[PDB]
Amino acid sequence: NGPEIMSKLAGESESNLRKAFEEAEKNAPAIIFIDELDAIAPKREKTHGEVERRIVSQLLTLMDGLKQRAHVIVMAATNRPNSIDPALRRFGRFDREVDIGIPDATGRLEILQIHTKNMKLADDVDLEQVANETHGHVGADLAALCSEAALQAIRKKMDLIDLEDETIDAEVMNSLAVTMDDFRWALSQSNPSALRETVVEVPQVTWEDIGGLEDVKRELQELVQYPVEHPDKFLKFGMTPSKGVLFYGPPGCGKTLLAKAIANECQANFISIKGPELLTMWFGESEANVREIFDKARQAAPCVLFFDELDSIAKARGGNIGDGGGAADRVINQILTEMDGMSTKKNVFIIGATNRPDIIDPAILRPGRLDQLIYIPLPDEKSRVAILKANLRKSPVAKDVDLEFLAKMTNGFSGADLTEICQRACKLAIRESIESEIVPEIRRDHFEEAMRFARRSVSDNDIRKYEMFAQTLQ
Amino acid sequence: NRPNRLIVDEAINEDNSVVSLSQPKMDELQLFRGDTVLLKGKKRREAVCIVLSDDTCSDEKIRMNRVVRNNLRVRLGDVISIQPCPDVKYGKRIHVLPIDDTVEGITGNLFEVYLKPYFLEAYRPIRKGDIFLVRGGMRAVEFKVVETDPSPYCIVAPDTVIHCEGEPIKREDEEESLNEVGYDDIGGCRKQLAQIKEMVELPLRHPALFKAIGVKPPRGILLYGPPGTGKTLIARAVANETGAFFFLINGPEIMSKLAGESESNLRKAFEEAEKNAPAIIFIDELDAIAPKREKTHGEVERRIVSQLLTLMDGLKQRAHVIVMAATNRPNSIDPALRRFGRFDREVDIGIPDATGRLEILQIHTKNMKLADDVDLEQVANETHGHVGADLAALCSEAALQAIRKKMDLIDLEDETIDAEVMNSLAVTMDDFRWALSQSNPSALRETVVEVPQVTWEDIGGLEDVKRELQELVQYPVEHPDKFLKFGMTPSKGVLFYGPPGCGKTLLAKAIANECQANFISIKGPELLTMWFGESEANVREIFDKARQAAPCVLFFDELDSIAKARGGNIGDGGGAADRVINQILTEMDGMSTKKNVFIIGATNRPDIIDPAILRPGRLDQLIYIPLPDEKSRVAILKANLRKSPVAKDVDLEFLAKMTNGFSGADLTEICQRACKLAIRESIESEIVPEIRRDHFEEAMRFARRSVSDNDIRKYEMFAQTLQ
Ligand SMILES: CC(C)N1CCN(CCNC2CCN(c3cccc(-c4cc5cc(F)ccc5[nH]4)c3)CC2)CC1
């Protein structure tokens, strides 16, 4: 127990930890499991105090002192790997590490199944709906979400009776059945927790969710899949594949979905670093956090590490006349440092995306970095029909509305501008449904009323800037 | 299934022996009311009380108070067999003795100081063998009834003789004293306390059930709030009303002890409280015992914290011990104390609010024998920043005034001053105002989280926009079944944009008031303080505070205030981003979905707003609050003037159309310019205080129009682009 050995007095604190490995010697094979290792060995060479110097040293001797008679495996848990003393990772101490990390949506279903298998659920709730609402919860939050929903129904039914003896009957508690109202109430009181932590997950968006962009879809699979699946071929010509890709184009044309969909296809982890996150390192002038983003990526491998909005810092300074400074700055510099320092291509693929390729530091684009520039342009009405169909595949749709016409009528829209319309009309349908009972379906006239507000984000002069940047790139 | 039909409940309406009982069935027991009725206690005890009707009582349960409850030895949530029988028989001269340690309150006549007003016109049925409470003269005491001539019970009238004794006797210790604090002695009507009820109901009122069924009851609970906000009340009054044994780990008491016997004293604390079950251990100043942030000067404190962590995890699932712990801020205590199984749930007690502060002022002055004039609601308004302890001090300080004034002029005293000689003292508004003058609050600095008092009426005009807010705010929570159908997620945000003074802040408060949601206003000087101090890490706690206050409306005033601080014409060379608005973006995207928290931004300058604010998943709905027209100007004028009384001759329809381009705030200037002059008249006339048509004419001489007409175009222009 991380703090149990701490609760003991000076000088008998070591006695209690050392006998721990001596006992577990005699039992073999055995796992010793130190939890809150950062309680017993949290020193970073910073180290207030006295006693703690000696608790850590004894542990180091103990972890090295494993005498190759018996088998003792020492598993140790901690919240962040930077927390524990650096001497604990040397060869023979804690050599392997595992990142357990936050569960993911279709991971959280199973935890909700294991904590409610005795509960005698209602039919309606399938737990998959709650699994979605739950992002930021961890297995302990979820075991608490269930126990809190189980304590609701006891409060409600049952004890109205008050009938009890030394043990309540097994069957008198059978009629209690946990309900969606109970769970929603429970979701309301969870208090998660882990919301702040970065998300590393196989993304749920697929190729279907992307209208258009067929060729670019092939080219990603080329860059991502062939070097790992056919390394025998790349070795033949001595050629090393590119680690990077830079997407460039107008806003809303599907650069982020295109990144997630190739990670989803490879069932790789996806890590999205968003422009506000690169801006927070820049305003806080802490770019030393770029390393752990990468370290996190290395641990999550195979992953696709995606940088949203990679010009966000160049805009923060400028982007017309800018600072007097050149294109370099502190955060994008560390991304360069940490790309070159990668241990070759090992399950980690980098994708940058930008609206403004003008203001991108041209050192980003160099060989061995994000070499492949792909231009994601505005859709045409073939890809607009596909984008419309791809958005509308979820919310049910009444057949009379015509999806081929809405396309060609919106001449210059980005993919996101078509989401505005689809969302403008689905809003009105909910607007009808709730006002009709105080027939909830989507109609051809809603996409007409939605269309009254239809706006085109990306002006036509800049399409030229993209094409111009693109028309230069040959 | 032929069930009796009685449940026991707290009773908010204030009564000595009166009961509410549900209208949805009055025919099952069928009591017309005012009819003497049985109440079945435990152990062989019974009670008699009078019944009244409440629209807002439940069909489920029964409002009754703490004197009836203690007699029966019933508790909250309990059920007592009940039966109507209408009959009652009169009685004589009921006989009375002091009960328990309490006494010496009354000198000489003790039924003049106590009895006469309460048995007067009441017909309070009074039992052999019960205790009841009479309030007055800055003290409370209880008179047992040992001997009553008729039995089992007697209704009382003032045709009977008056017998006196007045000599104390020890009350049985098994009894639960009525001075020990309970739900009613906790004021504020926060309703948050109801949340602690739901947590501690089953574990400590129903111990044997948790050995029958696998579930996890919460081991720890954190109360947090600034000092004096009643955190020790809540624990005392949960433990008192549930019968659990209250323990007390004095935050600095374990600290005052020496090294190595400091742990011995805390560890035996949980070992004792093991043997008593169910029990609440209440650690106050947890940040004294476990304030380490991994920063930690010293030695001993490392080991006090570790022992506590082991103790909090070491709860062995035999017995029930709940560990409640209070602290001033949740960031103060060690982060390992919140892991699963330690302190899992937290509660923010927080500062009371205006109509919350009334109840605290009622609970601390119910013995004081107040004057008529002061209703306490006026002082309740002046009091913002005070906490329950400030308010208990505001009352004790106003009670010590009147003693200083009247009374001791006499100097007449013996070993105990007579109970009646202190009756003539009556606390007065001058006493309270003097008291308000010397309070010294305290908590003024703390952010305010309150259901705002402004309503829809307070807003002239803006009818459509009023509907559209209810659409955005209310429909996703009330009809989630509908939004799920289309897979659509509602917007979390709204950005109000328009000229200054057109009612953007009132419009935000009024929708939070309607939902009776908490309202948190972050004002431009507060975003500027994070920016000059280049600490935007405080954006997280604003949001954390919002999450804890949920459902709330989190409103950002003046959200372009930082863009102005740099510029707003040519600005800095930098683009629209900066450190504080960046964290607001980070913390909006990081929200755990839409969970009772709605964000509203408001700006005068949409030009200089960082366009990343306006993106999907952020503050997507832009609503344009424009200048009023004379229909909405008539409504704004009427809405402002609904408070200050107005003499009918002044014409409110004309003042409107004459002021052609005014913002809503510019009309407040005029209304305030004229109300000033009326006070100017009133005070100069006695050295006829009413408001006149000519004042709004003299007010109008100064009438100024803030928002120039060229910029209305900028708003319309920004607006005319937005389609
Ligand atoms: C037929 C099927 C049933 N079999 C099982 C499923 N596999 C799918 C094969 N998917 C592979 C493995 C995961 N991928 C992946 C994930 C994450 C990153 C990378 C990656 C990093 C990287 C770095 C470079 F420098 C160059 C290329 C890179 N690719 C690859 C590549 C495709 C099929 C057989």
Ligand SMILES: CC(C)N1CCN(CCNC2CCN(c3cccc(-c4cc5cc(F)ccc5[nH]4)c3)CC2)CC1
């Ligand atoms: C008939 C009446 C007697 N019944 C009792 C009173 N309720 C009033 C219903 N009020 C609801 C609940 C509180 N509201 C509230 C308060 C604070 C925030 C939000 C909120 C957050 C949020 C986030 C989003 F992303 C989207 C929408 C959101 N709304 C809602 C919504 C209306 C009626 C029945």
Ligand SMILES: Nc1ncnc2c1ncn2[C@@H]1O[C@H](COP(=O)(O)OP(=O)(O)O)[C@@H](O)[C@H]1O
């Ligand atoms: N090609 C496309 N196929 C399907 N949906 C699209 C496409 N392009 C844009 N969208 C829609 O518009 C929104 C914005 O797209 P996004 O992936 O953020 O592009 P970018 O990252 O370039 O802004 C997405 O949520 C998506 O639903």
Ligand SMILES: Nc1ncnc2c1ncn2[C@@H]1O[C@H](COP(=O)(O)OP(=O)(O)O)[C@@H](O)[C@H]1O
């Ligand atoms: N909300 C409240 N309602 C009624 N009385 C209060 C309230 N808050 C404080 N008081 C009174 O003032 C004192 C508050 O002190 P305390 O209980 O120690 O609060 P805390 O635990 O927050 O320090 C109590 O003795 C109580 O009598």
Ligand SMILES: Nc1ncnc2c1ncn2[C@@H]1O[C@H](COP(=O)(O)OP(=O)(O)O)[C@@H](O)[C@H]1O
């Ligand atoms: N539509 C309105 N209805 C009622 N009062 C208004 C209205 N618009 C402005 N006022 C008055 O003018 C003052 C300024 O309004 P405020 O809510 O601060 O608007 P903003 O936040 O846009 O400046 C308020 O105190 C209010 O009394």
